[PDB]
C-alpha cells in the first residue's frame, strides 16, 4: 500500500509482489501515430495494468494498482471502470473509498471522470450526509466549477435536500455578486421549490435582482436573471418595469439597461400595444445607440434586431 509519489517508490517491474505476472506492452502498431513517449514510471504501471485487466484479475493487489493508473491519468475511463469492478468483487469498504475520492477531487477539481465515481459511490450507499459540505469546500476554491455544481444539483434533486440551498445561494452571491453560476443555482432552487408563478416570490426576486442591479450596474448577471424569469410570461406583461428602468437610466445606465428596454419594446409591439409606431421608434432609436456606440462589438446583431423589428411592426 505505497504511493505513486513517495521518494521510496519502486516500479512494478522491480517488484516482488508482481513477479508472477508478465506485463503487457501497448500495441501502437508497426508504424505509430500521435504516439506518446510515456515516461518510464508511467509506462511501467500501465503495462502491468493491461496485464491485470487483460486477464480480468479481480485481485486485492491490482485494486491498488488501479489507484496508481488513475493518478497517472485520471481521465482514463477504462481504468476507472476496472476499479469499480474491483470495488464490488473485492467488496472494498466504500466509505474508505469515499475518503479516497474526496482526496483526488481536491487535487484535480476539474476532472469529469473523478466526480462520476463519487456519484457512483454516493448512490451505491444511499448517503448524501456529506457531499454538500464537500461540494462547498471545492466551490470555495473555484466557485464556478462546473462539475461541482452539477454534482451538487444531483445530490440536491436526488435526495430532496433543498432546504438550505437558496440560503447557501445568497451567501455566495455576497462573496461575489458577479458569480453567474450562483444566479443559476438560485433559479435551480427556486423553480423547483416554489416556482416563480407565485406572485410573491417572483416579486421578491425582482426587487432583489433590481436592488442588486442598482448596486453593481455593469454586472451582467443580475440582468440576464431579471430578463429571464420575467421573459417567461412575457416581458410585455409587466408595465411598471419599462418605466423604472428608464428611471435608473442616468446614474445606472449601461447597454444592459438600454438593451433591456429594447427587449421590452419588442415584446410590447408583440402584444399589440398603443403608440405602436411611437414605440417602434423608441426601439430602432435604441438599436442604433447600441449598434453604433454603446455596444459596437454586437453591431451585426443589433442591426438584425433593427431590421427584424421594422420588417415585422411597420408597413
Amino acid at each position: 500500500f505505497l504511493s505513486l509519489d513517495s521518494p521510496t517508490y519502486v516500479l512494478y517491474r522491480d517488484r516482488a509482489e508482481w513477479a508472477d505476472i508478465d506485463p503487457v506492452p501497448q500495441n501502437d502498431g508497426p508504424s505509430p501515430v500521435v504516439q506518446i513517449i510515456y515516461s518510464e514510471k508511467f509506462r511501467d504501471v500501465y503495462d502491468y495494468f493491461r496485464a491485470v485487466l487483460q486477464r480480468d484479475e479481480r485481485s486485492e493487489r491490482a485494486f491498488k494498482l488501479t489507484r496508481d493508473a488513475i493518478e497517472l491519468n485520471a481521465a482514463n475511463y477504462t481504468v476507472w471502470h476496472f476499479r469499480r469492478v474491483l470495488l464490488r468483487s473485492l467488496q472494498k469498504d466504500l466509505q474508505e473509498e469515499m475518503n479516497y475520492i474526496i482526496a483526488i477531487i481536491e487535487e484535480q477539481p476539474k476532472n469529469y471522470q473523478v466526480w462520476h465515481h463519487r456519484r457512483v459511490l454516493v448512490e451505491w450507499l444511499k448517503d448524501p450526509s456529506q457531499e454538500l459540505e464537500f461540494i462547498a469546500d471545492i466551490l470555495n476554491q473555484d466557485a464556478k466549477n462546473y462539475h461541482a455544481w452539477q454534482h451538487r444539483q444531483w445530490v440536491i434533486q436526488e435526495f430532496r435536500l433543498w432546504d438550505n440551498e437558496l440560503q447557501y445561494v445568497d451567501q455566495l452571491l455576497k462573496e461575489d455578486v458577479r458569480n453567474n453560476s450562483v444566479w443559476n443555482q438560485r433559479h435551480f432552487v427556486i423553480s423547483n421549490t416554489t416556482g416563480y408563478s407565485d406572485r410573491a416570490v417572483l416579486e421578491r426576486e425582482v426587487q432583489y435582482t433590481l436592488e442588486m442591479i442598482k448596486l453593481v450596474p455593469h454586472n451582467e448577471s443580475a440582468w440576464n436573471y431579471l430578463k429571464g424569469i420575467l421573459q417567461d410570461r412575457g416581458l410585455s406583461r409587466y408595465p411598471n418595469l419599462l418605466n423604472q428602468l428608464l428611471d435608473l437610466q442616468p446614474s445606472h445606465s449601461s447597454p444592459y439597461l438600454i438593451a433591456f428596454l429594447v427587449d421590452i419594446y419588442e415584446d410590447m409591439l408583440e402584444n399589440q400595444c398603443d403608440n405602436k409606431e411611437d414605440i417602434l421608434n423608441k426601439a430602432l432609436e435604441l438599436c442604433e445607440i447600441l449598434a453604433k456606440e454603446k455596444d459596437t462589438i454586437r453591431k451585426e446583431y443589433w442591426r438584425y434586431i433593427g431590421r427584424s423589428l421594422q420588417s415585422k411592426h411597420s408597413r
Binding site: 501497448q26 500495441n27 501502437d28 502498431g29 508504424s31 505509430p32 501515430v33 500521435v34 504516439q35 506518446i36 513517449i37 510515456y38 515516461s39 508511467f42 500501465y46 497517472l72 491519468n73 485520471a74 481521465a75 482514463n76 475511463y77 477504462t78 471502470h81 469499480r84 462520476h116 456519484r119 466557485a143 464556478k144 462546473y146 455544481w149 452539477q150 444539483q153 462573496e175 461575489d176 455578486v177 458577479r178 458569480n179 453567474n180 453560476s181 443559476n184 433559479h187 448596486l215 453593481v216 450596474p217 455593469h218 454586472n219 451582467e220 448577471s221 440576464n224 436573471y225 429571464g228 421573459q231 459596437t296 462589438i297 454586437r298 451585426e300 446583431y301 438584425y304 427584424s308 420588417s311
Partner: protein, 397 residues
C-alpha cells in the same frame, strides 16, 4: 486601422462600478494584459502586420501527428482526438496528408475500435463516444475508402443503442453519465455513416431542448449554467436531428452574441467568466447554425454578407493574442500551446473569415490575405467537402 486598436476601444474596458469582487479582479487582469498586446503593435505597423504563422503552426502539427513528448501523457486515454485535432488543423491550414500517413492513421483508429462498436481512447480501451466522434471525424477528414471502411457501421449502431436511455439521452460511455455532448456525439457519428434507424434518436430532440435555461443558452444536463461547449453540441445535434426550432432560438442567439467580449474580441464560455482560446468555434461557431435555422423559417432580416458576431474583432483576437511563436494556438496570452486550442482557434478563425448562406459567399480576411483559412462545416467541424464525400459514400449501404 484595427477595431481592437481604435482609440474609442479604450472605452470598452471593464467597469467594476467601484465594487470589487473576484470575477471583477480576474477580468481586470485579462483586459489589462490583452491591452499590452494590442499596444505593442502601437510602436510600429509597417507592412501587413497580422500574420498567421502557417509554417510555425505546421511543424507543430506535422510532428505531434507522429509522436508526442511525455507531456501529452494525460491525453493517454484520448488519442483519437489527437488524431482529429491535428488532421483538422492541417486541413484548415491547408497541408496535404501524405497518403502514407493516412494509412498509418487508418491503421491506428483500427486498433482502438471496439469489437462491439465505437472507439476507445487508444488501442485496447473500452469504447466511449468522445473518441468515437473523433475517430469518425478524423477518418472522414482522410476521406479515402481506406479510411471509410475502417468504421464497422453495424457494431457502431449496436453500441450507440447500448447507450440509449428511455428519456432520449445517450450515456457518454457504458456505465458513464449523460450530458448534451453525448447526444451530439451519437448523432454526428450515426449521421455521416448513415446508420440512423427510425427510433434511434427518439426523445433526444426533446431531451436536448430540455437543457436550455433562463440565459437562453444550453447547459450539460437540465438545470446547469449555460455553457458554450454544450450550447454548440445542443444546437448542432438538433440541426442534424432537424429540430433547431425545438429551441427558443431567440433567447439563444441573444445569449451567444452577448458572450463575445467587447474589449477582448473573442468569446467567453459563460456569462461573467474569462475570454478563451476556443469558443471561437464553440460560440461563434453557433451563429452559422442559428442562421440556417432563422433562414430555414423564412425570417427576411438575416444579413446576406455577415454572420451575426463581430468577425473583424474575433480574427483580430485569434491572430493577435493566441498564436505562440513556437507554433500552435493558445487559450489567452501566456497559457501554453496545446493541440486542442491549436484546432479550435483555427476552426473559429475559419468561421470568422467565411460567410455564405445560399448563393451569397462573402469572406472577410483580417491580417494578410495569406491568413485565408480553409472553410469548415459548422456542424461536424471538418472540411465541408469531406462531409459530402463521407455521406455520399455511406449513403449507399
Amino acid at each position: 486601422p484595427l477595431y481592437s486598436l481604435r482609440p474609442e476601444h479604450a472605452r470598452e474596458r471593464l467597469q467594476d462600478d467601484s465594487v470589487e469582487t473576484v470575477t471583477s479582479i480576474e477580468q481586470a487582469k485579462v483586459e489589462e494584459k490583452i491591452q499590452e498586446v494590442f499596444s505593442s503593435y502601437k510602436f510600429n505597423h509597417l507592412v501587413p502586420r497580422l500574420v498567421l504563422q502557417r509554417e510555425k503552426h505546421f511543424h507543430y502539427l506535422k510532428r505531434g501527428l507522429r509522436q508526442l513528448t511525455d507531456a501529452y501523457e494525460c491525453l493517454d486515454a484520448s488519442r483519437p482526438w489527437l488524431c482529429y485535432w491535428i488532421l483538422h488543423s492541417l486541413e484548415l491550414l491547408d497541408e496535404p496528408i501524405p497518403q502514407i500517413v493516412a494509412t498509418d492513421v487508418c491503421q491506428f483508429l483500427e486498433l482502438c475500435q471496439s469489437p462491439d462498436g465505437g472507439f476507445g481512447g487508444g488501442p485496447g480501451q473500452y469504447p466511449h463516444l468522445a473518441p468515437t466522434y473523433a475517430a469518425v471525424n478524423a477518418l472522414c477528414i482522410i476521406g479515402t475508402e481506406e479510411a471509410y471502411n475502417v468504421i464497422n457501421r453495424e457494431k457502431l449502431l449496436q453500441y450507440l443503442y447500448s447507450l440509449k436511455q428511455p428519456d432520449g439521452s445517450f450515456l457518454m460511455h457504458v456505465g458513464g453519465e449523460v450530458d448534451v455532448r453525448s447526444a451530439y456525439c451519437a448523432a454526428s457519428v450515426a449521421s455521416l455513416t448513415n446508420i440512423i434507424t427510425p427510433d434511434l434518436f427518439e426523445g433526444t430532440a426533446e431531451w436536448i431542448a430540455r437543457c436550455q435555461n433562463w440565459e437562453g443558452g444550453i447547459g450539460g444536463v437540465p438545470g446547469m449554467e449555460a455553457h458554450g461547449g454544450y450550447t454548440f453540441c445542443g444546437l448542432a445535434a438538433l440541426v442534424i436531428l432537424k429540430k433547431e426550432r425545438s429551441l427558443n432560438l431567440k433567447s439563444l442567439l441573444q445569449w451567444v452574441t452577448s458572450r463575445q467580449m467587447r474589449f477582448e474580441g473573442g468569446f467567453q464560455g459563460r456569462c461573467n467568466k474569462l475570454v478563451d482560446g476556443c469558443y471561437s468555434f464553440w460560440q461563434a461557431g453557433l451563429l452559422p447554425l442559428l442562421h440556417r435555422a432563422l433562414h430555414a423559417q423564412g425570417d427576411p432580416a438575416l444579413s446576406m454578407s455577415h454572420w451575426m458576431f463581430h468577425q473583424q474583432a474575433l480574427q483580430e483576437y485569434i491572430l493577435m493574442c493566441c498564436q505562440c511563436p513556437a507554433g500552435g494556438l493558445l487559450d489567452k496570452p501566456g497559457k501554453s500551446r496545446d493541440f486542442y486550442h491549436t484546432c479550435y482557434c483555427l476552426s473559429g478563425l475559419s468561421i470568422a473569415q467565411h460567410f455564405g448562406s445560399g448563393a451569397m459567399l462573402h469572406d472577410v480576411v483580417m491580417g494578410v490575405p495569406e491568413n485565408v483559412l480553409q472553410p469548415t462545416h459548422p456542424v461536424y467541424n471538418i472540411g465541408p467537402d469531406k462531409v459530402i464525400q463521407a455521406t455520399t459514400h455511406f449513403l449507399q449501404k
